[PDB]
């Protein structure tokens, strides 16, 4: 029974703030759109690359204009072994994605701040719940 | 007069397509660096100067792309009281130069996120892009 983190890195990142600097004159009444998903790939013997996909879009309600759009593909290579089909499924769709989330959260907050928008720290995601939606 | 009103990022992109396997190749990096600037008046005496930076690194003994990073670092400046030439230098050299170190840190930051060895863009001589302008 094993679970080790070999490497954590980003495969793809995108941040866009189309309507700058004028959007800064509108009233900051944010509408956040948040999309998430994960995917796994065996990259070797007992080596799996787990990818956490985070998509975030913020628009200002009083006009619908887009403030910013941020997409992150956070990944990590893990050494996993000694688990029953179900146990492993949980580890690949919940356990590992969960370890990667705070990294992706930091990257999103880091880029958003570079656009000088008010802080955006994604709220915790219960992946054990996103695991249930998988068995179905 | 020359004052910095706000510094922000308009667009950012970092991609490392060949992970995690690329980490198995010999790190013999070949760096491609592209740069350019563009200005836009956004108000009375208010100009938005944008520094465009593109960086692509490939490993020589394979040609595979390690990572590609594109940044659009900008700033809004209050500029006034300059003759046509002095204003031109300010928009194509002075301002871009103030923005560079911020763009440098952004590239550096993203590269780190991909766990590649650190990349700290060497200083750029913006007076050169000023001359190119005049000509």
């Amino acid at each position: 029974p094993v679970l080790q983190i070999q490497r954590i890195y980003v495969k793809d990142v995108s941040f866009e703030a189309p309507n700058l600097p004028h959007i800064f004159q509108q009233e900051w009444k944010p509408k956040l759109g948040f999309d998430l998903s994960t995917e796994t790939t065996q990259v070797g013997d007992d080596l799996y690359e787990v990818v956490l996909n985070i998509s975030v879009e913020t628009t200002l309600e009083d006009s619908g204009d887009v403030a910013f759009i941020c997409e992150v593909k956070q990944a990590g290579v893990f050494t996993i072994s000694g688990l029953e089909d179900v146990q492993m499924a949980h580890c690949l769709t919940s356990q590992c994605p969960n370890m990667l989330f705070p990294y992706a959260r930091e990257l999103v907050s880091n880029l958003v701040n570079r656009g000088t928008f008010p802080a955006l720290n994604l709220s915790p995601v219960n992946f054990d719940a996103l695991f249930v939606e998988y068995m179905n | 007069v020359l004052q910095i009103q706000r510094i922000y990022v308009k667009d950012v992109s970092f991609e490392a397509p060949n992970l995690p396997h690329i980490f198995q190749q010999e790190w013999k990096p070949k760096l491609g660096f592209d740069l350019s600037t563009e200005t836009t008046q956004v108000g009375d005496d208010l100009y938005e100067v944008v520094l465009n930076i593109s960086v692509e690194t490939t490993l020589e003994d394979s040609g595979d792309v390690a990572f590609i990073c594109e940044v659009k670092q900008a700033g809004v400046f209050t500029i006034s009281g300059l003759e046509d030439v002095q204003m031109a230098h300010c928009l194509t050299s002075q301002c871009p130069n103030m923005l560079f170190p911020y763009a440098r840190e952004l590239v550096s930051n993203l590269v780190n996120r991909g766990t590649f060895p650190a990349l700290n863009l060497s200083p750029v001589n913006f007076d050169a892009l000023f001359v190119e302008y005049m000509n």
Partner: peptide
């Protein structure tokens, strides 16, 4: 032609996810 820019070919995909990919 920018990485985040819509790809020239109405794909809808960002140029880097279409005609600008470097996926070896």
């Amino acid at each position: 032609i920018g990485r985040n820019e819509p790809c020239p070919c109405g794909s809808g995909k960002k140029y880097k996810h279409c005609h600008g990919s470097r996926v070896a």
